[PDB]
């Protein structure tokens, strides 16, 4: 009703800028992406000035729509044209940061982000107030700090971000989990609570969430405990969590398995693991009412072979959680599998530090079947491990692979420290316009 309103207003106007845009709009309310680039297209080309806040937004949401459309090249250009326009919306600069994050370039990306911080030279004003401006930077600094493990100034981000928006989930669960790597749970729920991440039963029981699935029992604890008036049921489920990491047997009434459910503490993982640990629960019923009897006919009842994401998934949690004996059981039903399967659990192993196993099962693998990621362990390992002759080799194995991707091509640089100087030019070849690899030619340079 609306779209045919602004139709039949375009029948009679046809140049008008706005009312395109307007069309552009709702075409993106119903999905309809491609006709929405082609409506904000015409509304940018319409404009009869550049002033125009929906002239702005019709070249972000170009670039947007590109973005969302892996047209990368395409999303830039549309950006660096914009910039020139409008070099006071920072939108355009975080879009162009974005994409290179996503396209494996971080230094790059982080120059960006940190220009848009505390800049004093431009006034940036926002276009779009979907978040607080300075999140974005912060979150995606302490993304990448976290990656390159400066796990210092990632912290300083990520509480950075926290403090533009304090019901982010996403920066609450990085800071536990990086600080669950070094400190004591004590000393992670005394940084909680002075920070104020449990602002309300809600609120703690979505961290309850998370650090139940990663295996944080101590501080799962303290968090639920310092919780008032949680409905005894969804109390119940929480204990019984906590206790089965700990290798507590675990009883656990129906009620509560059923609220745990209902408050996302419990998905198809914990029941699985709790129908092995213990087969008298009524855990085959509670399955076969929530779509996922399949799941357990599967694992336990030589049925169907379900989809490898989610006999993945019950890996992953009896992984995360410690829980070798019911791994070794979900391991023995990998055979049904394509042998590329071992390429996705050499990756799990590998992403909770258990990189000996996971290589065991990288030499399953047909090296055509690896994942990018896969070739990232296996550099980063040999790496750790001085065999730089190997870890070249698999780096040299990426390149020719994933030509596209970054991360190859700065190994090969970092690793051939005998030809650093070519191997920067072969990488520029590929990505002439990243500017980290300028800077490390420079360097080069100064020590030739």
């Known amino acids: 009703r609306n779209l045919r309103l602004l139709e039949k207003e375009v029948k009679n106007n046809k140049n008008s800028g706005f009312v395109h845009f307007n069309i552009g709009q709702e075409m993106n309310r119903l999905g309809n992406k491609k006709e929405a680039l082609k409506e904000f297209s015409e509304a940018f080309r319409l404009r009869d000035h550049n002033h125009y806040i929906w002239a702005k937004l019709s070249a972000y949401h170009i670039a947007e ?3 969302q459309e892996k047209r990368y ?6 950006i660096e044209e914009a910039r020139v326009i409008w070099p006071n919306v920072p939108e ?8 290179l994050y996503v396209n494996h370039q971080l230094e790059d990306a982080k120059e960006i982000y940190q220009s848009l ?3 004093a030279a431009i006034d940036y004003q926002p276009i779009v107030l979907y978040e607080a401006t300075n999140f974005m930077p912060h979150k995606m600094l302490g993304t990448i700090y976290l990656e ?3 796990y210092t100034r990632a912290m300083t981000h990520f509480s950075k971000a926290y403090a533009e928006n304090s019901s982010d989930y996403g920066v609450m669960f990085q800071m536990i989990m990086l600080l669950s790597k070094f400190h004591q749970p004590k000393e992670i729920f005394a940084f909680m609570e002075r920070h104020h991440f449990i602002s309300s039963t809600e609120t703690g029981l979505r961290l309850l969430s998370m650090t139940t699935q990663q295996g944080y029992a101590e501080l799962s604890e303290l968090i639920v405990q310092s919780l008032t008036d949680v409905y005894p049921p969804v109390a119940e489920a929480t204990e019984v969590k906590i206790a089965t990491i700990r290798n507590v047997f675990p009883v656990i009434s129906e ?3 059923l609220f745990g459910i209902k408050e996302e503490l419990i998905d198809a993982a914990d029941l699985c693991l709790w129908h092995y640990e213990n087969p008298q629960l009524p855990i085959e019923n509670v399955m076969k009412n929530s779509d996922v009897g399949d799941i357990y006919d599967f694992i336990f009842e030589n049925g169907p072979r379900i989809s490898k994401k989610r006999y993945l998934f019950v890996l992953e949690r009896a992984i995360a959680l410690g829980k070798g004996e019911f791994a070794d059981y979900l391991l023995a039903l990998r055979n049904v599998y394509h042998d590329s399967i071992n390429s996705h659990i050499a990756d799990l192993f590998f992403q909770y530090d258990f990189a000996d196993i996971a290589l065991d099962f990288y030499n399953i693998v047909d090296a055509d079947e690896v994942t990018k990621q896969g070739y990232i362990n296996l550099i980063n390992y040999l790496v750790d491990a001085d065999v730089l002759d190997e870890a070249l080799a698999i780096a040299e194995r990426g390149i020719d692979n994933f030509s596209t991707d970054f991360r190859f091509y700065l190994w090969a640089i970092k690793i051939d420290t005998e030809n650093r100087a070519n191997r920067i030019s072969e990488a520029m070849d590929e990505f002439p316009n990243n500017r980290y690899l300028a800077k490390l030619l420079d360097e080069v340079t100064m020590l030739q």
């Open 92 to 99: 355009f600069p975080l879009k162009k940061a974005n994409i």
């Open 65 to 67: 729509l590109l973005e």
């Open 117 to 119: 911080l505390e800049n």
């Open 148 to 150: 390159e493990k400066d």
């Open 73 to 78: 090249d395409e999303s830039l250009a549309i």
């Open 255 to 257: 009620s509560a398995i």
